[PDB]
Amino acid sequence: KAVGMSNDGRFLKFDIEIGRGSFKTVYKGLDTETTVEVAWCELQDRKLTKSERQRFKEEAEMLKGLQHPNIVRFYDSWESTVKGKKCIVLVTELMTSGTLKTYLKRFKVMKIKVLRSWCRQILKGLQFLHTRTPPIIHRDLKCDNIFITGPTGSVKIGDLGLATLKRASFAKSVIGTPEFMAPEMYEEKYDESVDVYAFGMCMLEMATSEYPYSECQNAAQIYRRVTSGVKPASFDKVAIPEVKEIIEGCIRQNKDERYSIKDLLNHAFFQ
Numbered sequence: 001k002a003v004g005m006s007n008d009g010r011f012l013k014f015d016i017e018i019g020r021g022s023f024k025t026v027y028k029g030l031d032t033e034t035t036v037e038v039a040w041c042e043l044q045d046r047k048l049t050k051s052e053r054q055r056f057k058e059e060a061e062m063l064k065g066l067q068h069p070n071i072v073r074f075y076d077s078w079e080s081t082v083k084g085k086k087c088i089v090l091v092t093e094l095m096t097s098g099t100l101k102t103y104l105k106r107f108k109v110m111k112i113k114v115l116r117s118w119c120r121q122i123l124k125g126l127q128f129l130h131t132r133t134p135p136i137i138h139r140d141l142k143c144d145n146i147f148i149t150g151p152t153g154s155v156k157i158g159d160l161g162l163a164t165l166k167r168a169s170f171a172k173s174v175i176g177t178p179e180f181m182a183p184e185m186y187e188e189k190y191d192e193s194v195d196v197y198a199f200g201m202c203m204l205e206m207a208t209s210e211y212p213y214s215e216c217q218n219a220a221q222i223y224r225r226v227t228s229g230v231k232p233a234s235f236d237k238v239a240i241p242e243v244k245e246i247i248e249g250c251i252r253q254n255k256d257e258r259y260s261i262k263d264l265l266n267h268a269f270f271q
Contacts, residue, residue, distance in 0.1 A: 004040070004089075006078060011091050013040045023047055023165055029091065031075070038075065039094045042087040043162075045079070052164060056088060059161045062136070070125035072147060072158035090161065095147035100155070100206065103148060110206045112240065118155045119203055120270045122146060125157040126199065127261045130192045137190060139163040141198035143205050177211060178219040183227050183253055193255040196264075200250025207243050208234045229253040242269050 004013030012030045018039065019026035029040035045053065056077075063074035073093035080089045100118070104110065110118075122141075129136040140163035147156050168185045182197035184190055204212055212232035216222045225232075231251070238244040246269060249259045264270065 004080065004082065006076065006089070006091070011038060011040065011076070013089075024162070028094070031091075037094045039092045041090045041092065042080070042085075043090065045086045045088055048165070053088075055164045056161060059164055060090065063161050066132075066136075066160075068125060068128040070121045070154065070156055071128065071160070072156045074161065077161075092158070093156075095149075095156065095158065097148045097150050097153065099148065100143040100146045100202070103151070104143065104206065104209050109209055112243070115203070115206050115243070116269065118146075118148075119199075119206070120265070121155045122157065122199060122202070123261055123265050123270070125155075126195050127265065129157075129160070130195070130261060135192060136160065137192055138195050138198070139168075139185070139190060140166045141195055141202060143202055146202065172219060174218045178213065178216055178222050180213050180219075180222045180226050180232070182255070184255055186223060186227065191255070192261070193258045196250050196258045196261065197252075197255070199264075200247045200258075203243070203250070204232070204234060204238065204247045207238045207240070207247070210234050210237075226253075 001014065002012040003015045005011060010031065010033050012032060014028045014030070016028040017025060018028050024041055024043050027040045027042070029038045031038050043056070048056070060074070060077035064076060066074060072095060075091040075093070077088060077090045080087055098106075126138065129138060138157065138160055140159065141157065145157065145159040147158050148154070149156060168181055169188050180201065182190070182194040185194055201212055212234050213222045213225065215233050216225065235247065238247060246264070246267065252258045
């Protein structure tokens with residue numbers, strides 16, 4: 001039943017797989033100190049670069065100290081092996097009710113009251129990160145890493161450390177759904193405003209129930225459109241003018257012209 005544990009006995013791994021990605025497999029686990037189930041994520045160490053492995057360790061140490069209602073709890077991390085696999089284990093608060101991505105798939109639309117409340121919570125989570133000293137920039141905010149505490153619960157932003165694997169400047173294979181990112185992030189030249197861009201694109205997806213830029217077949221075509229100011233076609237499908245305006249001011253090409261988080265939280269839309 002237990003197929004691993006942390007060196008101090010505090011966390012146990014079950015052989016119950018609950019997510020997967022290029023770099024990770026996620027298992028259900030247990031905090032024996034509290035009795036609460038946790039997520040036990042195994043990062044494939046051999047795929048990482050030296051600088052990524054260094055970064056992950058530094059970021060995991062700052063992560064352990066963070067606490068905010070709209071950020072997924074990060075408990076700890078260490079190096080582990082099992083048979084021929086070395087990994088970095090990360091233990092986080094278990095999220096059982098899906099993500100914004102799963103919500104949209106299942107329920108088809110997000111009603112505006114829900115959009116308003118959950119977007120407000122995402123902005124509080126980001127304001128919290130950006131006001132840490134020094135600021136934490138998420139860098140990889142998306143619908144699939146904004147977790148819900150229940151189908152009518154609150155949202156919590158997750159994967160803050162995993163964002164250090166975003167590999168924004170890498171060549172990548174043309175397979176699966178091509179992705180966009182903020183124009184400056186292609187060159188790795190970010191600040192807080194990259195999270196505003198990403199927030200805007202998340203809101204657009206919430207408002208339209210589609211991933212932006214589906215008209216493009218690959219990430220190069222997306223790159224050409226994003227770095228020349230061309231909006232995703234789904235922008236024109238946002239039915240509510242107020243919601244469309246907010247998106248528009250978040251997803252500006254030039255980072256210095258985007259909304260600030262303060263100005264979003266102060267916007268009429270958000271009380």
